Amino acid sequence: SSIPNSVKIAAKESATDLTKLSVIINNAGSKTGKSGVSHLLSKFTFLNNGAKSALRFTRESELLGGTFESKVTRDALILNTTFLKQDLPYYVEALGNVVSNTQFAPHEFNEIVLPTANAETKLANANPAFKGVEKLHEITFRRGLGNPLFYNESTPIKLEEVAQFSKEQFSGENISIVAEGANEEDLTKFVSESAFCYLPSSSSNGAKALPTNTFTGQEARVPSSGASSALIGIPVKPADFGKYEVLSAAIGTSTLPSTSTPLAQIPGATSHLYKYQDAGLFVISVSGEASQVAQGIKQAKSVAESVSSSALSEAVKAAELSVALQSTVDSPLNVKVVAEEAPISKFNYVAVGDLDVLPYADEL
Amino acid sequence: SSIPNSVKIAAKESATDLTKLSVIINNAGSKTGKSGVSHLLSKFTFLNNGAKSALRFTRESELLGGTFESKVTRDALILNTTFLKQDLPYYVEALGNVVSNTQFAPHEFNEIVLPTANAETKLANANPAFKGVEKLHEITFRRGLGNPLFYNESTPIKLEEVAQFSKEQFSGENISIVAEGANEEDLTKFVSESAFCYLPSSSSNGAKALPTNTFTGQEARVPSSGASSALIGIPVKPADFGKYEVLSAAIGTSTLPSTSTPLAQIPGATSHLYKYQDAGLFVISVSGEASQVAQGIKQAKSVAESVSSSALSEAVKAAELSVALQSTVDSPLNVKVVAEEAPISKFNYVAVGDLDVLPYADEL
Amino acid sequence: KYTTLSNGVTVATETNPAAKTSSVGLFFGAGSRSEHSHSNGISALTTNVLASQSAKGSLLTAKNDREFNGIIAQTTNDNITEAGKLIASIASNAVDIVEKTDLTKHKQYLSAQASAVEADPKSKVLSHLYSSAFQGYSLALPTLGTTESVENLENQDSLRHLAKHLVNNNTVIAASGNFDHDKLADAIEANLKIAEGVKPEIKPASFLGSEVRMRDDTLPKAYISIAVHGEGLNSPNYYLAKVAAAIYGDFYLHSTIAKFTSPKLASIVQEYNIVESYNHYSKSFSDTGIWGYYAEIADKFTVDDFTHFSLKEWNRLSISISEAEVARAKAQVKTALAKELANSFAVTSDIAEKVLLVGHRQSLREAFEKIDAIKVNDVKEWGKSKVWDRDIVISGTGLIEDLLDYNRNRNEMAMM
Amino acid sequence: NYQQPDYSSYLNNKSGQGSRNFTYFMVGSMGLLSAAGAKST
Amino acid sequence: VQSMTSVVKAANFILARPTLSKIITPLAQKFTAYAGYREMGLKFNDLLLEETPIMQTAIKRLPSELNYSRNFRILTAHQLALSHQLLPAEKAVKPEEDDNYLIPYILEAEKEAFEKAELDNI
Amino acid sequence: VQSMTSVVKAANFILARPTLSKIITPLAQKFTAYAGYREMGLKFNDLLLEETPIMQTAIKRLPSELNYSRNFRILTAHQLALSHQLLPAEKAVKPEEDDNYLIPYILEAEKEAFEKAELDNI
Incomplete structure (x- = not known):
């Protein structure tokens, strides 16, 4: 299903009685922006909306028993949510307020995003296999899919860049809501009456996807x-x-x-x-x-x-x-x-x- | 000139009446041993001899006004000394006791060598140009000349390895004494009567020089x-x-x-x-x-x-x-x-x- | 859905058309709890040997749990019946498979796993916690045994273990996914042939408040775990224990939500960043359990502060937990139970565990109804009964020099 | 993980509440005897 | 201590009503001019009682330029008090430069604290 | 406190002379047996006064295995003194295991300190 913005909605019954809702920003992943912007954007997703702050939305979500995370993938930026079936009208609305009107306050950038992003990067790179895979993507797909999956200080990012990446992406064509354990009609109604109805159909000044340009025969070595x-x-x-x-x-x-x-x-x-x-x-x-x-x-x-x-x-x-x-x-x-x-x-x-x-x- | 060990001696007059004596261990550089052994060896050179400890030799040298350093180069390990013309019989003797019977005590390996080597490596690599040059040597001469010039924790080295690399190296055929501003005959006499006379002609179980094997067309990237x-x-x-x-x-x-x-x-x-x-x-x-x-x-x-x-x-x-x-x-x-x-x-x-x-x- | 086949073995399946992938597994109880020090790890070794057999396109894996063991053949839905037969064969020829096996490679793999649980700090901490809490009984033994005892195992010991424990009365065929239950039951019936025998008596175990300190000053953090005698799968307070644990919930300092998590302990521990991470858990065995928390402290000077604050928050359980915290804990426990039962492999494991250890598995709707009935007064009664002024079991691995002696932590359990 | 030393002999024969109740009674009696002595002094 | 939330609440209570606004605002400017802090280079928000967790957070979340300007103004005020001299009229802080730069950050800090308190008592 | 170097000087002064050796050494073994430290698991070098820069350096320069063995022996001694019990004769430190493991490092530290002092007064 789709709404005038062209936001695809897919829903199918689940096994465990959890409405495992999820929003997939098609090309807001690590491949699109400059190296590491998608990671910071993911770290900004659920903090501060125009409707509910972090300390309110998180507290309510925990009270409602749900879990929420934002994981960065090279193709897309995923906002995963998991909650009991009765809780769909809340989370979906919240998810709308996440894609639209996210605050991006500098104090959240310097306190909760850069520290968290750096901590996660250090934790992940500590595993030699993960860093090897990152280097393998770097040398196989020189740009785009080869961009590092996580933020690195070697490519400084300022809050203005993260905010401009949230805009110029997240457009109607660029997001797909996929749910497991939610009636597609009910989810479509909620999405139609949520903030998703206000997103632009297409990004005016970005999202010019580049060719993959696979490169083979290279090698690299990363001392550890x-x-x-x-x-x-x-x-x-x-x-x-x-x-x-x-x-x-x-x-x-x-x-x-x-x-x-x-x-x-x-x-x-x-x-x-x-x-x-x-x-x-x-x-x-x-x-x-x-x-x-x-x-x-x-x-x-x-x-x-x-x-x-x-x-x-x-x-x-x-x-x-x-x-x-x-x-x-x-x-x-x-x-x-x-x-x-x-x-x-x-x-x-x-x-x-x-x-x-x-x-x-x-x-x- | 040479002595029965085949230790080459070169001596020539100098402009600034300093006997800039120097010893060049031909193939004890960063190319020979496993990555980083030569750095640690260079850090062990002047500490504890079989004749004078670090705190004695350094104090005596400073009284004599001379300077001494040990620099690692991909070809050779260089022990430079610089002193007034009156001071040759001392330093040359010391240099002998540096090449022979250097103590390599574990407390120096843990207090003066590894900390110092790590500090030098970190300081050098902080310069992006030097890190780039090291990577360039790594990817151009895959082994030998491409070995990292400085000790890195990615290739752990134990004291026994450094000690066994001092031995099986430092041989008569493998060291070349060069001086500037010292009579070649007097220097030959001092070397002949110093510890240099006791070095073996050649290493029995090491120093199997490998071919250069230059590689081109490669590339690398080192985020920093x-x-x-x-x-x-x-x-x-x-x-x-x-x-x-x-x-x-x-x-x-x-x-x-x-x-x-x-x-x-x-x-x-x-x-x-x-x-x-x-x-x-x-x-x-x-x-x-x-x-x-x-x-x-x-x-x-x-x-x-x-x-x-x-x-x-x-x-x-x-x-x-x-x-x-x-x-x-x-x-x-x-x-x-x-x-x-x-x-x-x-x-x-x-x-x-x-x-x-x-x-x-x-x-x- | 249940069907007791011939031989008396019971096939329990939880089939749901929405399942992505199907799974079926034979579990014969008698985990490490059935072993003794000399022959510890034999159950895990035997299950590994059985699960190392040809898979015929399925995915055979061993379970190796504390109180039960089994082989699970995950497979796509349409192939499930084949997997059925597979495991049946694997268990009808268990003694033959073990006899023809050269255990050297399998013992090497098992010792590698045992070292792995001895290196992952959380695994080490919880293994030591269980060992010290139930010290003197078989329940204290590792699930995967120790690196010393594994090398002392032989084929004959595994054969004895199978003959004692791989019997009809002591085994269950669990299954989940999208398939017709009758087809799987019929496929297994024609292929399952295991020796008769009485269900082995489950060895006793009693909680003993103790403390174990593996202080390794070379580690970067302090990995501690503090618990009390919890609730086993039998106890009606099982879900109540889970709710009590969830009232304090999890926490990771560098997680984005760290400054917003509901639990009061979480807000308390950012003021000086006392602890890097922690998680409250209610591990439940057949008849006994361990209810407490695990925690990793980065700052070696704040272990005492974290233990003090956490045990004060436990004291808060029996006095001042508000309806908001209880409601949050109920919702979070319900969500966690639903999450644990999404993967068909997890559903198969849970079906086997419950059918072997309690005899009946409460459906997820029944669990939700039972959790919803919990009132704040119920949680406070449980806190008085099992937490307030009760013996604790402590474990620590590194930089625990700041972890004060047993008496300080124990006396923290009863101060207002 | 590893074998613990056998505390069999060291263990008390009292129940969970009995031992705790007796310990708290003794500590409270000490506290109130000290209170009585301090009051007298 | 009075919270900036309550101070701003009262200030907007007054400013909204034209009579009180006309009566007070001239008196407010007169009081702020007679206060004499501007003659020492201090803006109003420099005077705020820093020694509170809310206020400490507010300063800790200031931009770089505002933080350095605040540091310099505080240092200048300390030096002027030390030497018992005042800035000449031309160098003093003008009324239009007293721009209430730190108030928004303190208000955000108090908003966060108030939401946390409210939710802890949900 | 007597520098360990002086102790070893005196010990070799006595040991070198056969008469003084034959007299003292039996009394030396008897005195170390009656001392009572071996029954508590301690080797001789565990008793040494740790709170000195030279001794502290010597401990800091011990091998890992010797360091951990020393830690465990000290902990065992503390526990024994705490519980007022001694090790059985079969578990006590035998005379052969009282091996003077720390003296070489102490002597090296003393040598370094004495060289530094001598050169500082050159």
Whole structure:
């Protein structure tokens, strides 16, 4: 369904009796603005509206028993909400007041956003696999999808930029409300009578989406203390999402934690096909001691290739299960998993940690 | 000259009646051991000998008025000393007891070495240009000459490793004593009767020099706060040291700080031909504001190429001056500066700072 | 929906057409609580061996819980029946599978997991808390055993464990997702063949107020956990205990909502940033539970202040909790229960846990009705009964030099 | 996580309320005896 | 102490009504001129009692330029009191420069505190 | 307080002479047995007066394993003195384990301090 703004509304019954509402800003993610703006915007979403402040909306939401978060993804900026079915008219209205008329007060920028954003960036980058994945996106998709997912002080952002990003995005065409456990008619009525009805149909002065421009054969190395990690990244067209989900599930995927898979026989190894609107990245990562990772990444590379077509076909059902597990309300997924062969020769490589030990790309 | 250990001795008169004695451990630099061992070794050099402790040798040296330092270079580990002409018999003896029977006590490794090495590394890397140069060496000479010049916690080193790197190095064939303003015969006598006479001719179980293996066409990006910097690196054979010294001086070199040169016309730009035993790296760097550097690096690239052969020939004398300035006691330089044209198309590129602003290698 | 097959095994399924993915799992009770020190970790090792078998396109995983163990075969909806047969086979050939198995790799993996729970500070803290609280009984043993006992396990011990515990009276087939229950029951009936036997007696356990301090000064924070004897799955105060815990709820200092979270403890602890994070929990076993909080303090000089303020807020439970806090806690507990039961894997695990440990599973609507009935006076009665002036169990890992002795924290439990 | 030392012998035989009630009675008796002595002095 | 919320409440209670406005506002300017703080370079909001958590938050949330100007004005006032001398009329703070710069931040602080108090007693 | 360097000087002065050695050393072992510190788990070097810059530096420069062993022995001694009990003879520190582990570091600290003092008065 849609309203005059062209705000898509989708609703479907849920299992657990929670109306897990969610708003997906199509291209307000880390790919659109300058590096890290989407993270700060996400940190501003639920603080201070024109209707209810942070200390009021949070207190009421907790009283109403719901949970709310704003997570940044390279494609879209997601505002997730979860509440009991009777509580829809409240949260939806609040969500409207979040997309429109968010205050962006400098005191919230310097007290609750920059501190929180920096803390989350430091916490996430402490995991060598996550920082390796960020570098792999950086070197595979030079711009857009490769922009760092989190704010970094290396690219200073001022509150004016964050506010201008909230505007110039969040337009009617640019947002999609998706709910699980809410009647589509009732949700459409609430959205029509909420603040969503006031957003502009399209952003006048921004949202000029750039081409993906996938780049292959590159490599990078990011020295780190503690645990090391070696990653291999295959860029994939959207139409190939099926071939690699089968490959990943064939060798072992983060979505499906299970021994007995070829990639699980080596410590700390995993694989995962990050899926985006216009491109994807199949990442095979190994983590742990630098000495272990050195041979683990080479073994994982040799496992990804030389995977029997019979086992690859047998893994189709595991891939279907993995896709169904990933298809959360926040990130709808429609990938047809075919057993087709998936090449690996076009890999980018990233090393993190004890660079004196980790292998180079020419060593695979 | 030489002694039975095959320790080379070079001595020549000096202008300022200071015996700028120096010892050059040929291949105990940052290229030889695992990343950062040479830095810690250089920090251990002058602390505790088998003859005089740190607090005794330093006090005596200061009474004698001399200065001493240990600087790590990718080729060699240099122990510089500088003292009045009357003071040679002392310092030379001390230097012997530095190369032989240096104590390497754990309490120095934890109180004076690791803290000092970490402080020096942090101070040096705070400069975006130096971080960029280290990354450029890493991506141009993947091993050996590309090893980080300073100790980094990403590659932990234990005292036993530094001690075993002092041994199995520092051998007679591996050290070259150079002095300025000391009679070569007197210096030969002092060295022969010092501890240098007891060093083995060659290391029994180490010092297996590896080939240079220069790599080109690579690039890297190192996000950093504060000042940004974009660098371009041409690997060069030793026989080409003449061509690029003329090129650098033609456009502007760090050794010759002067306006009116094409590269000095743009803020923060400079060039320098790092010269090593078996390879060299010609680096054109720009530093400062990210927006300024973005255009500055492209301007510097366009300047390095398209330098008139007539102006290149005119720069021959300036290049000879620069070579004469660089040829200190520790870093003897023998490069014949010819005006022959020097290409740039094989450049590596590294960016540091606001990676959202700095261009990619594809933009030159 | 329940059906007692032949052999007496019960298939319990909670099928819902909206489920994204289906799951089915065989759980045979007898977790670590059924083990003893010498043979600790054998249940987890056996379940890992069983779940390491060929998956035939499904997703086999082990459960390895404190009081029950099982193998769960997650799979897309249409494939569920196949997964059914799979697990049936895996359990009809359990003794054969264990006999033909070289445990070296599986023991290495289990020891790796045991070290993992010994390195993740929260896992270490809660494991030590449970061990000290129920010290002297099998319930104190780790779910995954210790790195010393695992290497001492052999195939024969696993076979004995299976023969004792993998019996019809002591097993349940749980399932969830979108499928016809009758089809799954019929598919399992033709394939499930497990030995007869009486349900093993569940070993006793009694809470003993104690304190354990693994002080490691090299860590960056102080990871402490303080609890009291809680409510097991049997107790009618189960949901009441959850509400009491939720009254104080969670907290993370760097979370954006940190300055706005309802709980009074949260507002108290930003004034000097006493604590980095904490979370109140009501862990519930078959007949006993642990109700308390876990907390990570960054500033090593404020452990005492945090413990003081948290235990004062606990004192507030039996006196001055207002209707607003009770209403918030009820709503938050209802939302948390609904969240825990969204994933079909989680629903399968919950079905197995409840059917094995309490015999009957209260539907989510019944749980909501039972939580809604709670009044503030009920919560205060529970606070008087189980919290006010009651023994506490304490655990700490690093920089806990500031964590004062047992008497100070214990006496904080009864001052006004 | 690890084996605790056996406190079997160290344990009291009183119930949860009994031991706490007796401890509080003794402490209160000490407090009020001190109050009586201080009042007398 | 009286909250800026209540002070502004009373001030707007007066300002809205023309009779009280006409009677008081001339007296308000006369009182503020006779107060003598402007002769020492201080704006009114510099005089506010800083030693309160609300007010401390208000200063802690000032912009950079206003914060530095406030620091300099306070230092100048301290020096003038120290040397027992006043700014000449031309250098004193004019009535139009007494712009009530800090009031909005204090009002925001009090709004936050009042909402927190109200919700704690929901 | 007697500098450990002087203590070792005296000890080697006695030990070098066979008559004084044969006389004292039996009395030395007997005195260290009667001292009673070994029954509390303490090695000799645990008793040393920690509150001195030289001693504090020596402790600061101990290896990790020796540092943790010393910490546990001191904690055990405190617990034993607290509970008024002694270790059984089989658990007490045997004479062979009283190994003078800390003396080398103390002597190094003393050497550094004495060199600094000597050079400061050069």
